[PDB]
Design a protein around this ligand. Structure first.
Ligand SMILES: [Cl-]
Length: 293
């Protein structure tokens, strides 16, 4: 919009020259530096350096704002595509921030395969179905494989090294560690706003192991709900999409059936704001895609 150095009110060419000559080629250069560093580096009157510095900060939107108009600025709906039209549609557009979305099914139904894909797909620009955001992969079992990622990255013509740089990975070794990790997400995501996706494949893993009996069922429920509340609150309070998987106060629950060959049926089970349907997608070298026929 009011983007370049020229666009700011009645600035002289005489001036604009001295700015480029002083290495303040952009609005950002100005908006960071002080009028004192500017008024010597540019070689201009101090007052003038200050005028400009504010007219930049004002040209970019660096001002006071009511907390309401910051809400209205960023409360908008944000969704990440799965790679499958069909599946995005079932999801009414895709994976949504401030929502925990669960995918459960038997091994190789594509619950873990989605996670990988989405940890790439967040990094895409919005026009391409992403949020230009990072992702956190929490792994209970060692299911995570960077090579699955690398493949999905190649498949979009993306920079492989970079894609992998935008995914933080940890392995939950233990139910207790798994809670520490989610507990410490709050700091990490405040330290790094660009994180728009947390996945936890696959949550119950460690709870079933450590609390196996049907007397441990309640003993492990109280433990598992506490843990999902945490996740749910991260999503809401930090505007992040949370995905959990599962083998066989929460959110959306989608089951995943194996169908003919590479193709999978995702049916929705619990999501009262979503239509009751099921749809078919496919698992490919490239990652999640739509099916043939
Ligand atoms: Cl899977």
């Amino acid at each position: 919009n009011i983007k370049t150095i020229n666009d700011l009110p009645g600035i002289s060419q005489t001036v604009i020259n001295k700015l480029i000559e002083a290495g303040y080629s952009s609005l950002e250069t100005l908006a960071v530096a002080s009028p004192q560093d500017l008024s010597v580096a540019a070689g201009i009157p101090l007052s003038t350096a200050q005028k400009i510095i504010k007219e930049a900060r004002d040209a970019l939107d660096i001002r006071f704002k009511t907390a309401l108009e910051v809400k209205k600025e960023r409360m908008n709906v944000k969704k990440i595509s799965t790679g499958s039209q069909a599946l995005d549609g079932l999801l009414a557009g895709g994976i949504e921030t401030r929502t925990m979305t669960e995918f459960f099914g038997e091994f190789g139904s594509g619950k873990t395969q989605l996670c990988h894909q989405l940890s790439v797909n967040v990094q895409l620009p919005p026009e391409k179905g992403g949020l230009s955001g990072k992702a956190v992969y929490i792994d209970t079992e060692g299911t995570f494989r960077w090579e699955r990622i690398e493949n999905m990255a190649k498949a979009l013509g993306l920079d492989i090294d970079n894609v992998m740089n935008n995914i933080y990975y940890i392995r939950a070794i233990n139910t207790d560690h798994q809670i520490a990790i989610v507990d410490d997400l709050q700091e990490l995501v405040s330290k790094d706003p660009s994180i728009k996706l947390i996945v936890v494949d696959s949550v119950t893993s460690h709870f079933r192991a450590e609390y196996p009996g049907r007397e441990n069922l309640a003993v492990r429920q109280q433990k598992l709900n506490k843990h999902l509340h945490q996740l749910t609150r991260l999503a809401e309070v930090y505007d992040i999409a949370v995905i959990i998987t599962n083998q066989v106060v929460p959110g959306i629950r989608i089951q995943l059936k194996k169908s003919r060959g590479n193709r999978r049926i995702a049916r929705v089970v619990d999501a009262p704001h979503l239509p009751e349907g099921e749809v078919v997608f496919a698992l490919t070298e490239e990652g999640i895609r739509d099916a043939e026929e």
